[PDB]
């Protein structure tokens, strides 16, 4: 059929032997091959990693709840540890960290080549510990930012009423049990406006994502027909298809979802499902474009490797990871109630009012 | 266009290369012979046969040469090397068959050394080989 | 009698099999093997790396001054193309294009939409290949300029005269002939003063490094005896020592050497050679502080691997790796109420000349 | 009058700025204290005789002799040189700026004439007393061989810090086994006299250069 | 401002509805 790439294997073996022979430190073959595994996994896909025995044990059970962390969720798509999203209600967000900016060094250690997992692990620490991050803002001059890491506990959902008849549902992060809270907030809001609403500006911006089950629950809340997300990957078990229950606490309210450059996989799932099913109107800026799903594959003996086993897909053929979510209307956030604060929210609320008026009664 | 190593083939070839570089050449030859048997690919047989010839063994060299020649019929050098190695063992009718197969594609041919190697066997085999050579001459 | 790493190779084979049979995008074996080579080269120490075809070619262009180009170095200023410097005495730069020229179009595509690096690559190409570009100056009608790509030698050392009797040599980078260049400069330098130099301020601030031989050559050009630097490594060939020829164009003139925080291995070699030997006054900030002489071993393919063959040691026997040189004066960048550090160096040189009298 | 300091591991700073009967002994006192603070002969002493109105002439002669052991300090009645020099042999860089008048410059004067010290700073203020050579202090005043006008130097803080190889992960260990210094936050615990005053910084830098190239 | 903002709503609203 086809010839084996024996030339490349021979070249690798000879390279290994020459590296062992002509190196400074006495380096044994075991370390060389372990580094080979680590680096092939790293170069193949930045999110993938080789969780060895001790790392596997650490992943099996959480160490402790005392450890806090900056909270920012990062991604190595740019070659450095890029800040995909500073989670709301967190010291990182309160600082000058803005999604899309890089992190060159952490506490004085450059992160030009180190893996994302190592950088994130070094980020987490004891409550109240100071830390200095060197952040390259849109290719500008690097600057140092001092932050105090602490335990992170972000309320999932926040329901306000921008105007009698108009709601506003901010989803900070897709933690567990987000579906229950979202449904309860929708119910209490519906009660607030006498069991009827004219709009609901679901604010999924600067969202670092979360549990896919909770995202599917949220997308179900507003939907009664069609699928939310379906996965694709080479392994047999890669495909996973999700459905929407007919019941809906939304009550057919016209919707406007706001998309900011800090959107993540789960927020992308909800936004893409709502947009593709023609049940919403995306209004913010472009999304981020992260949809890969990583599954830990058990190894031969008390080892494992986290590899990107599949990627998500919105109900249409569009793949969120490849292109992200492209909103129907692109409104750039800027300074001019929550409406009076940001330009995106004011534009969305005005659009909802205009749509309500122009639809007739 | 490039085949893909199976797990066992990859592991065996890696350890064979490591052994060959660490001077444990017997391990390399054995692993390469086994991989030539299983995979049946040209390149593996090529490396196995070159290693076997360098070492100088006869049985492994013959087996690997036959596997290589069958796995790469296009390669005339493979065919003539297999014929030579077989002639080392006292078989020559297959040697002349392989020489004729090479004769289809123009290239360097080995006839005098094989004739010398076949002139020392039993009289019947040499007579049959000479008859076959004369018939081939009538064919050319 | 050392056994092969049988179990470790078993784990490697299993890992490669799973990676190929689980990763979403169909990835062929060759890619994963190349990634593994890159990984086991890069994960040992930061500086060791695996150089592919393009990386090896560009490194070869780096360590040797000559490279294919138009004889002009340019850049982008706030999204606008401006001519930076035409290299003198280069056939490709003989066009003498006006400084600050804004090339509107290169190779049939406007400069807009592509980064300055992409535009430079578009200008760059095989030697002997003519190119045509479109330029508009001061809002005038665009015109076509024809240029001839050629192999241009790039100077690495720049010489100046700051005060009558005092000079200044800046080594932007260490290249194959950099040492020679330095020597040449020194000669012409003394000619500018009719054969008498009262001092000199070598500038090695922000010098990423280069070939070791060039560093040794420049150090010897500034030295007249003793060992300049000696390398140590596990292998036999790495173990090496260098010397200094008695000849010295410097003429034993007072020397002040500047080292910044960006003075990497090769510049650190010259700095340490001139410091551990009482020959020059170091002044500045601590150097980057890396000593590891690497070797570009050529593989069977065009691509090559760069590996940290050995460390280097200064004449005193102290290794500067991971700690860096500590300048004697220890001057930091500041302002006086243009180059404060160089002004301090010149003041120190003049004061030393005066206190030395004749 | 005297006031000592240690600007560097071997670079004392013996301010005087005033001459009196006491200073004749206090100069040697602070010199001994500096010698004990830094063992062995210092690398170089910066005698900041600036803004000094003057004082008792004999005390000035005592200080001069405490710095040099030979020669005639000033002739007009002449002052000789004793064999005892508590200063040992330190490269002395006296400072004169314009307030150096009469007695103060006398201490400078002899030094500048005996080559024992270098007069760094702006020109000095300048019966009659003469320096050891024919040149006087009233005929033309003291002209320092190095003129360093007073100035202020303000270091600029860099937001971005250039990482050293100590920061890089998995860097090779030091060749000699010595400890590797990390690149932590760097700041001045106290504003040193060098960065505050430009003339003093120039004097210290010249002393360091002289010591590194020329012995002592 | 007022006219320009209505202009966005003048057509931005219609495209959201489509036809």
Residue numbers in the entry:
A (entry chain B): 38 to 373, 412 to 436
B (entry chain C): 44 to 183
C (entry chain A): 38 to 374, 416 to 436
D (entry chain E): 193 to 268, 277 to 326, 347 to 436
E (entry chain F): 418 to 436
What does the original paper state about this entry?
LbcA has an N-terminal adaptor domain that binds to CtpA, and a C-terminal superhelical tetratricopeptide repeat domain.
We next carried out a local refinement focusing on the upper one-third region of the complex containing a CtpA dimer and the best LbcA density, which obtained an EM map at an average resolution of 3.55 Å. The structure comprises two CtpA monomers, a substrate peptide, and the N-terminal region of LbcA. Interestingly, only the front CtpA is in an activated configuration while the back CtpA remains inactive. However, in the front CtpA, all distances between Ala-302, Lys-327, and Gln-331 are shortened to below 3.3 Å, except for the distance between Ala-302 and Lys-327 that is shortened to only 5.2 Å. We tentatively assigned this density as a substrate peptide that co-purified with the protease and have built a seven-alanine atomic model in the linear density.
